[PDB]
């Protein structure tokens, strides 16, 4: 019954499109949903297979923005739940036509040290070969 409340996340994530108008607005509000950061990754992930190649690339930006909206490494715990399927989600973007753009967010996580290299090995498996 109460589990229907989680649909407040999945219906809005499915409504997202390739624009900062939809990304920055929902990623800012998603930080107030930190009370369920464990399931938010499950909603956003299953929309990648639903979406087109350029569209699922845009949905992948949401995860990167939500990690960085929690910000300042004060806890940044959103990164830990995204790490559960971070490479598995990248398996939906093996096409070099999109892998080149998903490397944009993975490049930032690598330079911003948002993840240990041991995790990035799975990111580069899923984006490269």
């Amino acid at each position: 019954s109460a589990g229907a409340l989680e649909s407040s996340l999945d219906r809005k994530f499915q409504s997202v499109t390739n624009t900062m108008e939809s990304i920055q607005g929902l990623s800012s509000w998603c930080i107030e949903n930190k009370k369920h950061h464990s399931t938010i990754v499950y909603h956003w992930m299953k929309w990648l297979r639903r979406s087109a190649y350029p569209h699922r690339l845009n949905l992948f930006y949401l995860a990167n923005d939500v990690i960085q909206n929690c910000k300042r490494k004060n806890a940044i715990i959103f990164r830990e739940s995204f790490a559960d399927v971070l490479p598995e989600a990248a398996a939906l973007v093996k096409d070099p036509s999109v892998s080149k753009s998903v490397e944009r967010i993975f490049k930032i996580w690598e330079d911003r040290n948002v993840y240990p290299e041991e995790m990035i090995v799975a990111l580069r498996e899923a984006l490269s070969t």
Partner: peptide
Amino acid sequence: SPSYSPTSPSY
């Protein structure tokens, strides 16, 4: 529908 730049948000 301006698409954003991943480095724009701070961390």
